[PDB]
Curated annotation (Swiss-Prot), chain A:
Belongs to the Ycf2 family. This is Protein Ycf2. It is found in: Plastid, Chloroplast stroma. It comes from the Eukaryota.
Swiss-Prot record, chain B:
Homooligomer. Interacts with FtsHi2. ATP binds at G3, P4, P5, G6, T7, G8, K9, T10. Belongs to the AAA ATPase family. Disruption phenotype: Embryo defective. Impaired plastid biogenesis and thylakoid differentiation in embryo. Defects in the photosystem II protein complex formation. This is Probable inactive ATP-dependent zinc metalloprotease FTSHI 4, chloroplastic. Ubiquitous but preferentially expressed in young leaves. The gene is FTSHI4. Functions in chloroplast biogenesis and chloroplast division. Required for plastid development during embryogenesis. Might be involved in chaperone functions or play a structural role in the thylakoid FtsH complex.
UniProtKB/Swiss-Prot annotation, chain C:
In the N-terminal section; belongs to the AAA ATPase family. In the C-terminal section; belongs to the peptidase M41 family. ATP binds at G5, P6, P7, G8, T9, G10, K11, T12. The gene is FTSH12. Disulfide bonds: none annotated. It comes from the Eukaryota. Induction: By high light. Probable ATP-dependent zinc metallopeptidase. This is ATP-dependent zinc metalloprotease FTSH 12, chloroplastic. It is found in: Plastid, Chloroplast thylakoid membrane.
Swiss-Prot record, chain E:
This is Probable inactive ATP-dependent zinc metalloprotease FTSHI 2, chloroplastic. Required for plastid development during embryogenesis. Might be involved in chaperone functions or play a structural role in the thylakoid FtsH complex. ATP binds at G52, P53, P54, G55, V56, G57, K58, T59. The lineage of its organism: Eukaryota, Viridiplantae, Streptophyta, Embryophyta, Tracheophyta. Homooligomer. Interacts with FtsHi4. It comes from Arabidopsis thaliana. It is found in: Plastid, Chloroplast membrane. The gene is FTSHI2. In the N-terminal section; belongs to the AAA ATPase family. The chain holds residues 399 to 767 of 876 of the full protein. Disruption phenotype: Embryo defective. It comes from the Eukaryota.
Length: 327, 352, 240, 498, 369, 209, 39
């Protein structure tokens, strides 16, 4: 069932206007004091440069071997790229969120994005081997037919011998021939200590990259750059002061996307385009609070003093920790 | 329905079938479950359609534990999937009972409770969960006199008095136990060619049915005088201590030395009514606990103790620890300590 | 939307008045028969969500999700396929589902409920898939009185019946329990030949249930003789 | 099921060696096989089954084949691992087919190699297990239903008696149980005579020394000995097996092959050399002076072989002296164990290393064994303690198998209750170890010249012999100054020629 | 399928019966005189269970009672019921009981019920559910619904504690008979019946053979018969005597006697060890009757041994005196006593390390017993 | 992707002290391993300060040298960091010292009295009977050797206080130091090295023959 | 529980090794509890 939906992801090729629009893309608001400057993230810059080199067909021309000048320029360029891997592994699923960066970088890639699933090769249990071999060779032939394209393989740890053979012959054959050398075989998982040492060769799925948890400045930057891309301008009072830094939480990925969507929904229901303090507070209150019937309050004042004292102490003393609301 | 094994659940189901006068559908638990999927569900839905066609009907399912077993582990063999398919199919058929068209009554019977899944017992499926427990003394009398209609006795008054006196010593016994006592007494009488059930046949049936014998060998052993003497001295010491320290509820009645046991072979006249027991009663029980070791140390010396009679002051130790810790009229305190862990290291020397 | 609470509180009433006041198609199934057999393990979830999409915008309401999203779903592959299908239909991501994430056909609200909120997986209650959680609890005394009036309207009550003096005896009772109590009082009303149902019928029903709760099934005659069997002084101690 | 029906199996009772007791017991089976009439007239019930239990490579299959060859009866061979399948019931069908083909040509012998494959015990520590139980049921039914008058003897060869079900050990199925002990010195001698007739042999090879100096080696291991000797002679292009090539095969299979140029620093070899030479010197001195009941040094090496950076070779004595280990014998062996640390303490002064730690652990455990397990001293002890660490008895390193083994308590342990005598046992062990350490260091420090000269000679030659150590000990008497060694033109020079 | 042919075993074929045989013929009476049993109003007890040590021949008793009853005999292994598939075992039990009811009157035998009679809730697996299903099916076909009054089940187990108390409920398994180990006369008659098929002599006394091999099962006596055939052709005598039986029993209880090379001091050490044991034993009451004394090494024991046969009634019941254990500890310590008194304190050996720990273990068991 | 802290001297001062103390105590031990490079990496998860050390049957003296070296960052942070600002940086080393000392008492027998008593082996799962009151004695021995290594480190680290201050400020102002730079610092400012033979206690030291 | 089969050879012990094993563990646990709850 997966072959039909991955065969129809691009039944028609990208139009000239679409390719021309994608070929002239820009940086889009990195140099702001509120969101995601240059030095904040080096890995995404490297992935952006890799996919940009993939876009302009700058990988099939692997070398020049000229007299002195173009060789020097190429050496300097290869220095600047890292500080030309045709396949890159990323191992950063210790926190949350996998697709939240892959599709975020592929939305402007303009090439067919094919995500083959390895779990389909496990639930099929001399007829199974033939069916599996035909299926995997059809996937690889379709991926070749969609050149240039980006192949994403999530959760390698599910891998069984037939797929291993397919992958090893693909990465042993399609890197010195098969003219479209720019076929990215990017892959992600959450356990790096179980992969076999035969799949970490320099010619076979090298350059591992880590993804860590999100810190508070990174949370603010990601929230701002996620709210701004939908025409919603952040009001110049919370990122202009210490307003929403002291109330923000959800220090993980996929916890800011839902918060951003809830805040945008709340502002849309008010027919507004700016987000104030109250909208963020009402969005945070709707995620970490449970709706309840048969409501009853505290009948003994005296636990109220406990909460008041703890909150005052946590406010004045620990100036780098949140305060949950008291009720 | 559920309860102790062999309490008469099948007899109650047969009584329901007989006295109902309604179309009765006897089924089985493990009849439906097989290795091939779909057979159990098809069988049960055919049964349910048949009961709906013949409404009103009494569908009885013996031993629902076969299919009603709760998931308590990974079913690698795959039969658990068939069991759950059948179970959920029974649940859907039960929930498909509209009150205006289906007068079908489900009668369950099981010997276990903890292995059942708490969805059949939910509302709309099993509302009434009754339990037939062990009958009382009147209930025991009723079941033994019901089981003794075809049973030939010397006279009606003699039969009645024998039934009453066996009813007074058959405590903690279910209907199967009393029926088997009567059955074994009949076996003894037919073997001995006696046309009526004598008293000694009831006595031997009771002796067999409580499992007094465990060796099960040819009882022909020349007991040395050194053993008859030890048993006689132990029994006499127990008699002397019991007469000197009178227990208000267990007077000594009979005494034999014909058996080797860890405990003395004494018999007490049990009178129910132990609501209260004073500290003096606990002290007297402690004194009575350690009689054989004292008597064997007195007459025969320390170097002649048995392995059994020296394992008698240990029970006195347990009883004294019970008195100190779990009764609370000593000077140890007025708390109730359960021996496992609420014994802080300060109270250990005091207890010792 | 994740509903939670004790069973029998009328969790279906919330969804039904949801459908009634909202005026939408309401796709409703049960999660027990989704791990049915080998003919269609996870295809029922897919056809469920396809019917929901084809009639979108609408609601999706599934009963006893703990039988699907339980903590033992990753052990059984048959459970795992169903859970993966459910969690894939829960989101967008056009591949493997073949539909635009933002569309009228994707305006579907997934209502789920169970009786054991802590038994569900950590990745199913995550925000983005399950956003709001409603906790419905047992009613209190006045709602119990109203339910007693509602479920006993079509019965011949006496003049001395008043449930306001037995609210303390029915703590933790659900609507099904109050209905069973009324039916119990009616049955022991007709058993004793009584035409109506006074307060004493309800008192006797509650008292007999309490007596049965510790495993005492005795009629009046056997209870009387067993009371007469015990002596006087050892009853005098229990009296003090 | 191609059960080979061979009229002549090709091996007889002259091809087996070292199995004298078992073949003498099986001579009754051979007599039953060749003529059962005199057995039948007097009324014997012959054994329904005979179970051959023993170590691998001892030729139990060869024993059964020789029985069939001498008896002149067809031999049915099909291993236990041939009874395991995926489909259910096929193994029982194969059992029935093999049994009925045996009943066709009576008398006949049924042999099942590795019978424990189908007869695994239901240990309480897929459908294949049900197949194993059904095959076991069919086999026991066929064995119990076998009338003894038709003379079909069934043989079962196993490597482990513990995993085999006790139902087969019940009389009526396996009446006879024969152990196949590893061949003795005469047995290994005869196996060497048999296997040496197949390859070209020189007169310089003395197989008696090889049979005596290779204890517990199976017949297949002697076969691989002679085969690797042949291949070594092929590698050296020798026309026949020389004694040097035979010893080369010995050091190839015992300790392992020699590496090429893999050496550590000059300090990493001096410490190992000092330890091994000190152990050898203590052993030789205890042999010379007090006439201990201990072993003798053969050769000491620091050339890395296998996974040992250095090695000292000790002969193995006769087992009759390995039963009543007295206190003095254990004390001298324990002194031999601390000889290494004595060498590090006298040569390096006070900077010892980690090369002698294992000998220290062995000494510490055998002190406890002397104290607690054997209770050789005479304060009586209430309990023994199991070894926290277990090292198997092994090759050229110190024997540690004088009482069968060192790290094996004979189930002589109990959990302790009193914790005040445990410290007195620890103090007694510390006192014994410390006193014994001072005695061994005092005896070794009295001879620094012989120790230093042996270390230098072994460092120069990378290998020394026991006779060379004896020559150094004789030519360097006690209490001679170290300057006598230090004035020599070459301290690592050996003027003695073997 | 589960029906066997040629059941000719009777009570004469089996020895060591005793009063249990009476119960056995009672079963025969249940199959013959049941008319007056049901005339008086007695329901025939379907469940009879033989419990005892293995090798006593419980299945042989089943064949005997089936042959004497003169009915159809079913002998089914309980290991076939447990399987990786579910439902098939229940159908197997259904077919078994259906063909037993169709072949009425008949007796059915199932051996080793511990495999399938295990209490439910002890193992977590599909095999446990299949075992529960088979147990439920056999329970229903035993007592569940009406329809059986003629088929009687006989069973043979070893451990009675493992069985489900639901099975032990009267009307399903109410007759519980224990088959003890044969005593003195029982071993005599078992040896006689197992030796009737071979030509014996008139001067053959089984009393010494029975007293020599004490505390052994009937299968071991059949084994003694089996080692009464193979070992006389080495010398080639005329007729079997009691000496061969005594040597066969000596070989069986310890092992085969093998001779190896030995020095003089080793023989002296084993001799003084055995002398220590016997000499300290003869002065004590519980170990006074030393009958054999040899230093010959046997299988597993390179030492010798001392043979005593004390009274075996007080030991089983527990009526051993405190002095009876202080004497045994002295006996175990006396090898070390002889070693110390002969070779000195400084030359203690390690040959007595097996008795020196038995003494301390006995002392430890005494002080906290 | 992001550093967890800014590049201010108040943050890098504990890490500079840590690295400088470790490098100095590496330098002052004779015949020990050689420190090569020191730097302050802004985005290292192990810590801001990083130190490269290249190693030169390990004898008793090598283990003693390692044990006394295991105190350098802790003692440097003790003289240099002001009160009110402590570190959890040296803890991962100090437990290593807590690992090292017992090894000469249980495993190798290099105890305070050069006793051949061995109670632990490489493949052992537990120890011997060990007594009940005998454990206090060996515990005192282990605390003795640990304190002896600590006092040796303190004595040979407090005599290079100004050199340590120099190394800290050069590390703070240059962010890169090499072995040649450390040699220059310990030469100009008067660093005093230790001399062979190196022992924790000279009361039982002997000389090889 | 005193090794009900009598030993015909004196070499065998009168008690099984696993007879008094729960009491040893009970005493060890009690002593360890007293030792740990005092320091």
């Amino acid at each position: 069932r997966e072959f039909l939906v991955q065969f129809s992801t691009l039944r028609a090729e990208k139009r000239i206007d679409q390719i021309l629009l994608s070929l002239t893309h820009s940086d889009h608001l990195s140099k702001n004091d509120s969101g995601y400057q240059m030095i904040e993230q080096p890995g995404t810059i490297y992935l952006r440069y890799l996919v940009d080199i993939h876009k302009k067909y700058l990988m099939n021309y692997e070398f020049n071997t000229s007299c002195l000048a173009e060789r020097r320029i190429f050496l300097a360029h290869y220095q600047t790229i890292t500080y030309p891997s045709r396949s890159i592994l990323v191992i950063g699923s210790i926190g949350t969120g996998r697709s939240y960066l892959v599709k975020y970088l592929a939305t402007n890639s303009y090439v067919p994005f094919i995500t083959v699933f390895l779990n389909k090769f496990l639930d099929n249990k001399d007829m199974m081997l033939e069916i599996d071999r035909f299926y995997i060779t059809l996937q690889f032939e379709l991926a070749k037919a969609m050149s240039p394209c980006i192949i994403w393989i999530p959760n390698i740890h599910d891998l069984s011998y037939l797929a291993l053979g397919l992958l090893v012959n693909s990465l042993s054959r399609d890197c010195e021939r098969c003219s479209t050398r720019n076929i990215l075989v990017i892959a992600s998982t959450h356990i790096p200590q179980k992969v076999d040492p035969a799949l970490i060769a320099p010619n076979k799925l090298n350059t591992c990259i880590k993804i860590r948890r999100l810190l508070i400045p990174q949370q603010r930057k990601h929230f701002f750059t996620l709210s701004y891309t939908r025409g919603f301008h952040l009001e110049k009072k919370m990122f202009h002061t210490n307003g929403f830094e002291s109330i923000t939480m959800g220090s993980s990925a996929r916890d800011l996307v839902a918060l951003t969507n809830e805040a945008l929904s709340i502002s849309i229901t008010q027919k507004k385009s700016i987000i104030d303090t109250n909208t963020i507070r009402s969005a945070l209150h709707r995620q970490t609070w449970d709706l309840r019937s048969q409501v009853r309050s505290v009948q003994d004042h005296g636990i109220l003093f406990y909460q008041i004292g703890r909150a005052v102490a946590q406010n004045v003393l620990i100036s780098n920790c949140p305060i949950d609301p008291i009720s | 329905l559920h309860g102790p094994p062999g309490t008469g659940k099948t007899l109650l189901a047969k009584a329901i079938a007989g006295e109902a006068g309604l179309p009765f559908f006897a089924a089985n638990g493990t009849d439906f479950v097989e290795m091939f999927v779909g057979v159990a569900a098809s069988r049960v839905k055919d049964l349910f359609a048949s009961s709906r066609s013949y409404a009103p009907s009494i569908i009885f399912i013996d031993e629902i534990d076969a299919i009603g077993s709760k998931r308590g582990g990974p079913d690698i063999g795959g039969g658990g999937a068939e069991r759950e398919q059948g179970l959920l199919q029974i649940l859907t058929e039960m929930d498909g009972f509209k009150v205006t068209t289906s007068q079908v009554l489900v009668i369950g019977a099981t010997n276990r409770l903890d292995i059942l899944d708490p969805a059949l017992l939910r509302k709309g499926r099993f509302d009434k969960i009754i339990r037939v427990g062990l009958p009382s003394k009147d209930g025991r009398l009723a079941i033994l006199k019901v089981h003794a209609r075809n049973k030939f006795f010397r006279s009606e008054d003699e039969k009645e008095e024998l039934l009453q006196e066996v009813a007074e010593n058959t405590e903690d016994f279910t209907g199967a136990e009393l029926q088997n006592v009567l059955n074994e007494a009949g076996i003894l009488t037919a073997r001995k060619d006696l046309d009526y059930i004598g008293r000694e046949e009831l006595l031997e049936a009771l002796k067999r049915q409580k499992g007094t014998f465990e060796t099960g060998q040819e009882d022909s052993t020349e007991v040395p005088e050194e053993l008859k003497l030890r048993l006689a001295y132990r029994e006499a010491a127990v008699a002397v201590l019991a007469c000197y320290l009178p227990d208000q509820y267990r007077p000594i009645s009979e005494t034999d030395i014909n058996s080797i046991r860890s405990q003395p072979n004494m018999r007490y006249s049990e009178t129910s009514g132990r609501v209260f027991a004073r500290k003096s009663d606990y002290v007297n029980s402690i004194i009575r606990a350690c009689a054989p070791r004292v008597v064997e140390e007195e007459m025969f010396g320390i170097e002649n103790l048995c392995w059994i009679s020296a394992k008698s002051t240990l029970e006195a130790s347990q009883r004294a620890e019970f008195l100190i810790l779990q009764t609370g009229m000593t000077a140890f305190g007025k708390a109730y300590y359960r021996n496992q862990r609420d014994l802080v290291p300060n109270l250990v020397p005091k207890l010792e | 939307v994740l509903l939670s609470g004790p069973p029998g509180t009328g969790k279906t009433l919330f969804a039904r008045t949801l459908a009634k006041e909202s005026g939408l198609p309401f796709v409703f199934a049960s999660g027990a028969e989704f791990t049915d057999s080998e003919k269609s393990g996870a295809a029922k979830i897919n056809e469920m969500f396809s019917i929901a999409r084809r009639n979108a915008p609408a609601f999706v309401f599934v009963d006893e999700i703990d039988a699907i999203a339980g903590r033992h779903a990753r052990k059984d592959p048959r459970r795992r396929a169903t859970f993966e299908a459910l969690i894939a239909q829960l989101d967008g991501e056009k591949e493997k589902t073949g539909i635009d994430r933002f569309s009228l056909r994707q305006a579907v609200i997934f209502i789920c409920a169970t009786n054991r909120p802590d038994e569900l997986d950590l990745e199913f209650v995550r925000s983005g898939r399950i956003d709001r959680r409603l906790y419905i609890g047992l009613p209190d005394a006045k709602q119990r009185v109203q339910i007693f009036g509602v479920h006993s309207a079509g019965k011949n009550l006496a003049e001395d019946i008043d449930f306001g003096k037995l609210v303390f005896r029915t703590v933790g009772f659900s609507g099904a329990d109050i209905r069973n109590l009324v039916n119990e009082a009616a049955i022991m009303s007709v058993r004793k030949g009584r035409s109506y149902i006074y307060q004493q019928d309800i008192v006797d029903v509650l008292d007999k249930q309490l007596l049965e709760g510790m495993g005492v099934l005795l009629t009046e005659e056997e209870q009387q003789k067993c009371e007469q069997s015990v002596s006087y002084e050892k009853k005098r101690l229990l009296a003090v | 099921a191609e059960a080979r029906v061979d009229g002549s199996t090709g091996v007889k009772f002259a091809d087996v060696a070292g199995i004298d007791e078992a073949v003498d017991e099986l001579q009754e089976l051979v007599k039953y096989l060749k003529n059962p009439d005199l057995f039948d007239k007097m009324g014997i019930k012959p054994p329904h089954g005979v179970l051959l239990e023993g170590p691998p490579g001892c030729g139990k299959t060869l024993v059964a084949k020789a029985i069939a060859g001498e008896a002149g009866v067809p031999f049915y061979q099909m291993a236990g691992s041939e009874f395991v399948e995926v489909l259910v019931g096929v193994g029982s069908a194969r059992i029935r087919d093999l049994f009925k083909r045996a009943k066709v040509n009576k008398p006949s012998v049924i042999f099942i190699d590795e019978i424990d494959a189908l007869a695994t015990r239901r240990q309480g520590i897929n459908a294949a297990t049900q197949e194993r139980e059904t095959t076991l049921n069919q086999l026991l039914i066929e064995l119990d239903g076998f009338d003894t008058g038709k003379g079909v003897i069934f043989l079962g060869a196993t490597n482990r008696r513990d995993l085999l079900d006790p139902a087969l050990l019940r009389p009526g199925r396996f009446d006879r149980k024969i152990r196949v002990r590893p061949p003795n010195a005469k047995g290994r001698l005869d196996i060497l005579k048999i296997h040496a007739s197949k390859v070209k042999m020189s007169d310089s090879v003395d197989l008696s020394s090889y049979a005596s100096n290779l204890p517990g080696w199976s017949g297949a291991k002697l076969a691989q000995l002679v085969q690797e000797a042949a291949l070594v002679a092929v590698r050296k292009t020798h026309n026949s097996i020389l004694q040097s090539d035979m010893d080369d095969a010995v050091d190839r299979l015992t300790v392992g092959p020699t590496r090429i140029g893999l050496e550590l620093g000059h300090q990493g070899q001096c410490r190992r050399a000092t330890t091994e030479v000190g152990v050898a010197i203590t052993s030789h001195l205890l042999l010379r002076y007090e006439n201990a009941k201990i072993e003798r040094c053969d050769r000491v090496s620091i050339i890395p072989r296998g996974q040992t950076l250095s090695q000292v070779v000790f002969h193995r004595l006769d087992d009759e002296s390995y039963m009543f280990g007295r206190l003095p014998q254990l004390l001298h062996r324990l002194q031999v164990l601390l000889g290494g640390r004595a060498a590090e303490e006298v040569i390096y002064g006070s900077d010892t290393s980690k090369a002698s730690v294992d000998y220290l652990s062995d000494a510490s455990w055998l002190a406890r064994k002397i104290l607690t397990i054997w209770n050789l001293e005479n304060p009586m002890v209430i309990h023994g303690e199991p070894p926290p660490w277990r090292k198997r008895p092994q090759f050229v390193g110190p024997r540690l198998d004088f009482e069968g083994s060192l790290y094996d308590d004979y189930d002589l342990v109990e959990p302790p209750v009193n914790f005040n005598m445990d410290d007195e046992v620890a103090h007694r062990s510390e006192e014994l170890i410390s006193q014994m350490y001072n005695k061994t260091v005092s005896l070794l420090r009295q001879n620094q010249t012989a120790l230093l000269k042996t270390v230098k000679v072994l460092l120069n030659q990378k290998e020394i012999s026991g006779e060379a150590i004896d020559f150094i000990l004789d030519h360097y008497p006690p209490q001679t100054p170290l300057n006598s060694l230090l004035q020599e033109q070459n301290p690592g020079s050996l003027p003695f020629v073997p | 399928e589960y029906l066997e042919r040629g059941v000719d075993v009777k009570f004469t074929d089996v020895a060591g019966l005793g009063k249990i045989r009476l119960e056995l013929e009672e079963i025969v009476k249940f199959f013959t005189h049941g008319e007056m049993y049901r005339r008086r109003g007695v329901k025939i007890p379907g469940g009879i269970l033989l419990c005892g040590p293995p090798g006593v021949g419980k299945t042989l008793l089943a064949k005997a009672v089936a042959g004497e009853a003169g009915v159809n005999f079913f002998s089914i292994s309980a290991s076939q019921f447990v399987e990786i598939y579910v439902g098939v075992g229940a159908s197997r039990v259904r077919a078994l009981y259906q063909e037993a009811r169709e072949n009425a009157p008949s007796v059915v035998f199932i051996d080793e019920l511990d495999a399938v009679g295990r209490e439910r809730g002890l193992i977590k697996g599909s095999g446990g559910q299949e075992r529960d299903a088979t147990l439920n099916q056999l329970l229903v076909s035993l007592d569940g619904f009406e329809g059986r009054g003629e088929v009687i089940t006989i069973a043979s187990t070893n451990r009675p504690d493992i069985l489900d108390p639901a099975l032990v409920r009267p009307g399903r398994f109410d007759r519980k008979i224990f088959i003890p180990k044969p005593g003195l006369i029982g071993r005599m008659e078992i040896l006689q019946v197992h030796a009737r098929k071979k030509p014996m002599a008139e001067d053959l006394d089984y009393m010494a053979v029975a007293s020599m091999t004490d505390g052994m099962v009937g299968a071991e006596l059949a084994n003694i018969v089996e080692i009464a055939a193979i070992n006389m052709m080495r010398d080639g005598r005329t007729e079997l005597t009691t000496d061969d039986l005594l040597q066969a029993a000596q070989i069986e209880e310890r092992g085969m006697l093998d001779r190896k090379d030995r020095s003089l001091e080793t023989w002296r050490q084993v001799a003084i060890n055995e002398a220590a044991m016997a000499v300290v034993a003869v002065n004590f009451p519980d170990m006074k009757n030393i009958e054999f004394l040899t230093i010959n090494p046997r299988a597993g024991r390179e030492l010798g041994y001392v043979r005593v046969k004390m009274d075996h009634i007080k030991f089983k019941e527990g009526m051993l005196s405190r002095q009876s254990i202080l004497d045994h500890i002295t006996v175990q310590l006396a090898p070390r006593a002889a070693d110390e008194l002969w070779y000195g304190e400084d030359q203690l050996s390690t040959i007595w390390a097996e008795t020196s720990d038995n003494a301390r273990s006995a002392a430890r068991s005494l002080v906290l017993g | 992707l992001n550093p967890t802290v800014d590049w201010t001297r108040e943050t890098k001062f504990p890490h500079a002290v840590w690295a400088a103390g470790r490098a100095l105590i590496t330098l002052l031990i004779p015949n020990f391993d050689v420190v090569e490079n020191l730097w302050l990496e802004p985005s290292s998860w192990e810590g801001i300060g990083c130190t490269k050390i290249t190693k030169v049957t390990e004898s008793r003296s090598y283990l003693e040298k390692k044990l006394v070296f295991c105190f350098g960052s802790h003692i440097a942070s003790q003289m240099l960091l002001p009160p009110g600002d402590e570190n959890f940086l040296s803890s991962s080393e100090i437990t290593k010292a807590q690992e090292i000392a017992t090894r000469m008492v249980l495993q190798y027998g290099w105890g305070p009295d050069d006793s051949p008593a061995v109670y632990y082996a490489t493949n052992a799962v537990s120890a011997l009977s060990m007594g009940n009151n005998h454990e206090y004695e060996m515990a005192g021995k282990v605390e003795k050797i640990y304190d002896l290594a600590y006092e040796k480190a303190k004595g040979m680290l407090l005599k290079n206080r100004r050199v340590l201050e120099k190394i800290t400020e050069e590390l703070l102002e240059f962010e890169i130091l090499t072995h040649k730079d450390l040699e220059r610092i310990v030469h100009e400012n008067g660093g005093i090295r230790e001399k062979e033979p190196f022992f924790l206690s000279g009361t039982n030291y002997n000389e090889a023959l | 529980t005193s090794q009900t089969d009598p030993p015909t050879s004196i070499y065998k012990r009168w008690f099984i090794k696993n007879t008094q094993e729960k009491h040893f563990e009970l005493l060890i646990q009690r002593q360890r509890w007293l030792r740990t709850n005092s320091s």
